[PDB]
Amino acid sequence: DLRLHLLLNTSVTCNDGSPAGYYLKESRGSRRWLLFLEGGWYCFNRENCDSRYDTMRRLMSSRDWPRTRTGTGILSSQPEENPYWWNANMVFIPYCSSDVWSGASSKSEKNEYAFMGALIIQEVVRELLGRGLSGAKVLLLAGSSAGGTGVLLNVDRVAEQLEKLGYPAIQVRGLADSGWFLDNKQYRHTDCVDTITCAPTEAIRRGIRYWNGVVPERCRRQFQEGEEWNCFFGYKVYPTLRSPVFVVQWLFDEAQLTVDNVHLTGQPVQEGLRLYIQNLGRELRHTLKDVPASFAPACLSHEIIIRSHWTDVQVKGTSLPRALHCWDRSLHDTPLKGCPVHLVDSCPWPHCNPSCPTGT
Ligand SMILES: O=C(O)[C@H]1CCN(c2ccc(Cl)c(C(F)(F)F)c2)C1
Numbered sequence: 001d002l003r004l005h006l007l008l009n010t011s012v013t014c015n016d017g018s019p020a021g022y023y024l025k026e027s028r029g030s031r032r033w034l035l036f037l038e039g040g041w042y043c044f045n046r047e048n049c050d051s052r053y054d055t056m057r058r059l060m061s062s063r064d065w066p067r068t069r070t071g072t073g074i075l076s077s078q079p080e081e082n083p084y085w086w087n088a089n090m091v092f093i094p095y096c097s098s099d100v101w102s103g104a105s106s107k108s109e110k111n112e113y114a115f116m117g118a119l120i121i122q123e124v125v126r127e128l129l130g131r132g133l134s135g136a137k138v139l140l141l142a143g144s145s146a147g148g149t150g151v152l153l154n155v156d157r158v159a160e161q162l163e164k165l166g167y168p169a170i171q172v173r174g175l176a177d178s179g180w181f182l183d184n185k186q187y188r189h190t191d192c193v194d195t196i197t198c199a200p201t202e203a204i205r206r207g208i209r210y211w212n213g214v215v216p217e218r219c220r221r222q223f224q225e226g227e228e229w230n231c232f233f234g235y236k237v238y239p240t241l242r243s244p245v246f247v248v249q250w251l252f253d254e255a256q257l258t259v260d261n262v263h264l265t266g267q268p269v270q271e272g273l274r275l276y277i278q279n280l281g282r283e284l285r286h287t288l289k290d291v292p293a294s295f296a297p298a299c300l301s302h303e304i305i306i307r308s309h310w311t312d313v314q315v316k317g318t319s320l321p322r323a324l325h326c327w328d329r330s331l332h333d334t335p336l337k338g339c340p341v342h343l344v345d346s347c348p349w350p351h352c353n354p355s356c357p358t359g360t
């Protein structure tokens, strides 16, 4: 079990001004730290955020958080469930800022809600330094869905924070799960009227302004003012990052298909939709060709790494826990015999990989 700590700096808050926080299970005598960013959509205007506050309040407030959580998947301390990092210090950072971990804006007389995701990460890191993180060798910033994009947006800022604080020996790395989106055309066009079916480019263009969102500096310098939304898209921000980042991404991610206004009904798939889905998977594969540490199975699914059965999927015969272990070996101070790190399916249709999650 991981135990809740609300941030001592109560200026760093969830959307409604309640303190943000983190859940921690220490492993003395491990110098590995895993800091995991939770996902769960976002809200990009007052109207949608008010609705989210009414029926998704745990994603906007710490008032009702439990005092513990059980670590699962990559956050499990059992080797059977987590062959990769079962002995690590484990941190789960709840997503309560609704901003894709990008915001640096407090609640004020001008702002109904605080969007502080980027500051929450920084504050968690600062407070953990006093609880053992100062002795770390590796800090893996991991996250799923909105938290996977959060890793891309924040890993280099964590690295720079630790450098500036006088901790150059902590190696900061990122693990971005289900956060690698395409700013593509919807299958059928919707106007951006609510959250889940707003087209990707429009959702981020609106959100970055509403959240006062911040993006990595090198990417900001490329796209410049008014175009920083581009830096939420993995294929554009990734080449600008300095920290090692391992990318986990289903080729047919259900959240990608949702923002693309595709709903698979179990009904027969007609030619236009078949072509749309095949081209989506091919585009995703193309964007990963030059990502050396990646795991991209040809499945229709959502979010892998904190599920208890995350061990089961394989690409080319290699599981994600194995690929992550191979990645660790590759970052010891040339490819490794039988220990691959670039694992992207080539087959063109969901579930062409037999190891895809069954949905059971
Ligand atoms: O948390 C979650 O379940 C998912 C839901 C969709 N989502 C997300 C995150 C980043 C970006 Cl860039 C985009 C998009 F649509 F603009 F591409 C969507 C995280």
Ligand SMILES: *[C@@H]1O[C@H](CO)[C@@H](O)[C@H](O)[C@H]1NC(C)=O
Pocket: 009, 011, 012, 119
């Ligand atoms: C709390 O966080 C804010 C924003 O990150 C910062 O300006 C302030 O100095 C912090 N407070 C303390 C006591 O460190």
